[PDB]
Symmetry: D3
Subunit: 251 residues, 6 copies
Amino acid sequence: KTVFHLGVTEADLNGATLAIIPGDPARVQKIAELMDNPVFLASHREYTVYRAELDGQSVVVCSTGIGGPSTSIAVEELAQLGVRTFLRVGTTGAIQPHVNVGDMIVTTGSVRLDGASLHFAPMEFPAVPDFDVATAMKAAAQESGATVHMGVTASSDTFYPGQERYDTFTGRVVRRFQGSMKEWQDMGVLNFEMESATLLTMCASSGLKAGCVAGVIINRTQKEIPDHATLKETEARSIKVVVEAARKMLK
Amino acid sequence: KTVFHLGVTEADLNGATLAIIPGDPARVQKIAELMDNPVFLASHREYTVYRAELDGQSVVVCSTGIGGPSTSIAVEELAQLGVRTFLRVGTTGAIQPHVNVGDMIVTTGSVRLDGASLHFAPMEFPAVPDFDVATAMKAAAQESGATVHMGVTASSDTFYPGQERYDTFTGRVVRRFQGSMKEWQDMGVLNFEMESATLLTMCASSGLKAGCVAGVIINRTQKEIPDHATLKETEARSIKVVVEAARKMLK
Amino acid sequence: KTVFHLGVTEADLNGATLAIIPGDPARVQKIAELMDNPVFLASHREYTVYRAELDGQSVVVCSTGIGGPSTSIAVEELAQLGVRTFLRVGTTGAIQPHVNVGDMIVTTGSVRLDGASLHFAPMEFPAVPDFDVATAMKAAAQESGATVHMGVTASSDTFYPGQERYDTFTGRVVRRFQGSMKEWQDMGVLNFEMESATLLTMCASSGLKAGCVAGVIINRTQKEIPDHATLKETEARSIKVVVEAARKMLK
Amino acid sequence: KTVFHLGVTEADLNGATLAIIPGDPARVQKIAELMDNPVFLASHREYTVYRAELDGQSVVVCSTGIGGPSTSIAVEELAQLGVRTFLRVGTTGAIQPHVNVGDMIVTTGSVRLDGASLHFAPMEFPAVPDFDVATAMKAAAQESGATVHMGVTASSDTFYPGQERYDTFTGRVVRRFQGSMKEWQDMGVLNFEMESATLLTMCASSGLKAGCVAGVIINRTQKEIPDHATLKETEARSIKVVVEAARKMLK
Amino acid sequence: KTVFHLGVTEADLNGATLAIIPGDPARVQKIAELMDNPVFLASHREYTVYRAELDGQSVVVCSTGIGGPSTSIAVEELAQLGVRTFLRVGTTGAIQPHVNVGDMIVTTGSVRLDGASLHFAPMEFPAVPDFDVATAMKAAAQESGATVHMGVTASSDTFYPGQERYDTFTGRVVRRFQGSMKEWQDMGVLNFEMESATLLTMCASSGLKAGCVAGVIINRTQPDHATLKETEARSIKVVVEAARKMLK
Amino acid sequence: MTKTVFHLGVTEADLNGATLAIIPGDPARVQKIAELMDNPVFLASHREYTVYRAELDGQSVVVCSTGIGGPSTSIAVEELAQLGVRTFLRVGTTGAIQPHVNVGDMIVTTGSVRLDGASLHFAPMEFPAVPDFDVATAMKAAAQESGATVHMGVTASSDTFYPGQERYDTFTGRVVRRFQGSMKEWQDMGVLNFEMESATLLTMCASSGLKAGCVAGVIINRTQKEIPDHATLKETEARSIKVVVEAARKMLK
Ligand SMILES: Nc1ccn([C@@H]2O[C@H](CO)[C@@H](O)[C@H]2O)c(=O)n1
Ligand SMILES: Nc1ccn([C@@H]2O[C@H](CO)[C@@H](O)[C@H]2O)c(=O)n1
Ligand SMILES: Nc1ccnc(=O)[nH]1
Ligand SMILES: Nc1ccnc(=O)[nH]1
Ligand SMILES: Nc1ccnc(=O)[nH]1
Ligand SMILES: Nc1ccnc(=O)[nH]1
Ligand SMILES: Nc1ccnc(=O)[nH]1
Ligand SMILES: Nc1ccnc(=O)[nH]1
Ligand code: NA
Ligand code: NA
Ligand code: NA
């Protein structure tokens, strides 16, 4: 039946139980076109939905928009339509000097600097991926030839103060986040992004399998600008990797 | 000089210091066309940006996407480029029996059931609108002929469990939100939505003027299903009202 | 049916549904005498209660004492006796450099640095005034010829550490409140006082109408202890304004 | 030289290092007259201040008003003027069946259901009396012929919902306090009052010696209405006890 | 009825309603031998359990191990077997300059820097001793000749970062605990240890009588081996005398 | 290599270059683990800390008990880290709360619900109590290779045995508000089991540049009212320690 936001039915999905969920609606077609018979299903707000086939099995590709709230809607509605496995892909910036542009990160757990995760489980609950998904993502990332980092991701409800950026309109960062970047660095946290805490917490507490993989396209600690070719290659590699991770998850 | 997500420059805005900020990218052109000389500026992710003119003054119309996190990026980046006043328009679900479909709500304060608000101010800080904006929204709303409610809005990082919906994949609501709708009802809360706590807290703690006005499209307490015609006219009235409220702020 | 603390009955109030609620018991008579036929009703502990007539309608004046706890008792017991509208008048310390001694502040929202507000609503709930009362207070204040500020007030359970005063017995401030004044200043908070968070949260969550107006007796950017000379003039103008605000609230 | 709220100087105190601090301004003279050479010093707001002499030594008697906020002001200002020891006497509602109206309670620790305590120490810090003061209070109470109980007191910023009273304007108790009376009862808590958490935390964290002694005026488990005669004797005995406790504290 | 961890039955305790609870299993025999007819009952994990007689009445000595979690098990299981009064003894480091080695501290309340206390009562609840026990410990400590301090103890789930120790593997202390020693010092807190918040909160909220006494052996702000052994010997002599005062 | 740590009573030289530790709870289990490896030698015993050294495939390995709970565990981990240990393999017993898990099964923790206090002494509550991925992987492989039934998932890690695991057959029969209904809540959220050390261990290590993981044998299932069998508990513990030694083998190469 037609879910509230996504504008698709269970029949539209052709039995798909796995979704690849990028943030950017414009990335959906690109991911779908790496698979067989890509088909456009719907586009509403930040949700662009395609179906495709991978080794003869139906897979959904659905954008999430930025942030846990829009992500939580996409995940819930896809689950209502029979999806059980969710593969998050994106590109990210690193906060460790040893992590290079072109490297890939597979999240083993997220720092819950969001609000939506608390709508599924109290803060004590760990924002952790399904072990099978994380294993598949590591395997796919490594098999691509990239240097892969397994570790903790800080997942923030903001791009600016929650990631301790001072180059802003006010130049102010609330007490909670003052000195926070150095704290996460010292604790070995690899990167910031904005959706994994919500995704991982929601899925781990709701009987759904989820994981996160990302290509590194910038490093907060490095002054040097990466060249255009490296950015293109990394974005291309990240989606090739998520599709092969999906291959490894299919039964 | 070009902001990171919105893809616009200060020059693109032609001196605009006021923005109207709907959730849905598709609503941006619809708002802009109610004003003079609407021009498309940019579209990236959930962010569609137009400029227009109201009584000879430049105004920006920019979508936010769903939720506090994506909203916080749009507000920050517009503020970087000189925007100081932010008028939120949308549609909403009422939780009070006396609030009917077709009515308008102007938020006097938000229950902070989000995460991004905490990235700007600790929980004790009030999610409140600028008084001039709330005043102008009330006046514009009344002048349109619709019945207007001033009151508190519950602002949730989720559509489902944070609004205590049980017709879901798991059918569960975390302890925090069990019984929460009845709690807000008894406290006189008017409605649920998903962006105001973030918007109002961010602006009120950052020297920005903000307010929220919404048309009522559903009522959680009423079993009767509203007419298609009511929905249409409420949507049109919502954006007429927000443009008139903008006019009052510019005078 | 005599209420436990205030020592008055419903009959004593002569049909009054509106109360003016200053902090100081010795201030009650002065306010009542600005109106017609003032009548002493009772005095117990910090609660002195008078009745008077304003444009022919009965009005109650009742002191609250200092702080949310004593305020909460007065409001509850008045509400039991049929009072629905509460107008708070008081003194305050400005934390913005541009706000002058003698200026008036009308609170649009309070930072909840109290404990009693939490006995009525969780911290997420906004300490927000009734829109009609805030409108009436602004109008009364501006019409008087005063310089008036609308904005956020920090409402503290203490006069000393919670308002980051250092000229004290210990000269220490607990970690939570170290740097807090500068934080509130950067967030655009106008002033400090000690009852608004309790009053506004209690009322907004209980179907009662409330607002707060305050005369500035000190600017904290330059001084800690208010001086008694400028206090008398500011207080006299504050009570004229609250009386006019009551006039605007009568049906 | 003159403290802002209390309106007294260090010289006014004639070297007093100990204060007896009742809640009700009208109780101040009654306590002072049990000692030698009682002299009225000042009355401002809820603060009535007397000096007297006990075994040759100067003692201050100062009312606090209801609640932690007003109490914290009196304690601070008296400490500025050399007072180091604070003996609280007051009324209380017992919540255990075995505690009778007329009995006395000496608080060994307080459940911090207040806000002002947090302005001196984080919630982890114990709201505990000075051991010498608690010891002197127990001895004084026993020596008067009262039945005395040592134990934990629940200290609330409200009289009504924080003490789980439902006979109120709304008839509602916020989630936090629903079922709270039974919880404290099962935890062995003896009584409710409204000042001890603030007093004990502030003093224990500030190098001041404090304790609390109270007469039971009602039992929340008993339907029997207290005898007028017993309540009168109870009030009389409480103040005789606190004075003898002061005697024991002085050299 | 054999309890899950302690390996003893109600009969093993011979009617004891009072327990002395040191942290170190090796101190259990030492305490028991200060009394009459000491008898080994059981040793499992960090729990070594003896019985003895004091003025004709049975008393249990049972170690707790380090920390609130292991303490909470010992207390619960002893309470299932009829124990109602719990006397905690140990040695401790002071954080106030005026507190000297050889002095005794009797805890009047604990700063709850633990997690187990929250399993019995919310944070607002005071980690406070039973007044009779605290009174008996003060009396015994003073009667011994020691200088005694009645005051607040900071009770931490860690030895290292929660006591703001920087001489560690990482040299890092989490934000929460940065500057915390100075804060407790300025608030008049006497000392750090690791079990009192759990013990006191659990007992005060469960109808059990508890208190804590400790000998000062070092000072974080400022000792002879002869004085140190004397302090340890004195601490357990004091707790046995406090037990004597609690018997009815 | 010559300074003695405060609680454990060992020096760096005593460890013979060991960078990996196996950390059971029970001091009595230390020798039993050490004897599965080569040249086991007793080093020290103080309080709940019994320390042995052994050799695995020619590499020195430390076995050190933790006692019950986050606080005692945190001391052992810190002091071993001071002496050069970088990898920590926890082995223990656990109560399952899912009906599909059987007594005798093995659980490898993928993340812990932080119902402890010591984890907060290393990182704020938002930080995930997560194992090192290599350790969790080696534990899964070791457990599968022993023929055991293995479950990967979330563990609730409690500072108490009784109220924090929602047990009511206690002295008071009371459970504080926070924990009322909590076992059903974790059950519905897919949590596998209760134990008492993983939240502290995993948070401390993940935030301190140390590698850690947890494997446990199921001794009780809360959904099955069976009185623990003696022969079964012994069999479960023997298998558990075989698994953790094989997991260490995998980490050393
Ligand atoms: N700097 C200032 C000045 C005034 N006030 C207000 O006055 C009363 C206590 O003086 C309190 O009731 C409070 O509302 C304050 O809190 N801070
Ligand atoms: N049942 C009761 C009885 C008495 N009290 C104490 O008396 C004052 C409010 O009447 C307050 O100051 C409070 O200390 C109370 O709080 N609850
Ligand atoms: N950035 C942060 C640091 C510490 N605590 C938080 O909640 N957040
Ligand atoms: N630095 C960042 C890059 C991409 N996404 C983020 O959230 N942060
Ligand atoms: N934080 C909360 C959310 C919803 N309901 C509550 O009572 N509290
Ligand atoms: N019920 C609702 C309608 C519209 N928006 C919401 O967030 N919720
Ligand atoms: N410094 C210390 C000495 C003894 N015990 C502690 O916990 N801390
Ligand atoms: N049920 C349990 C068995 C073993 N350990 C625990 O902590 N809990
Ligand atoms: Na979005
Ligand atoms: Na008062
Ligand atoms: Na232990």
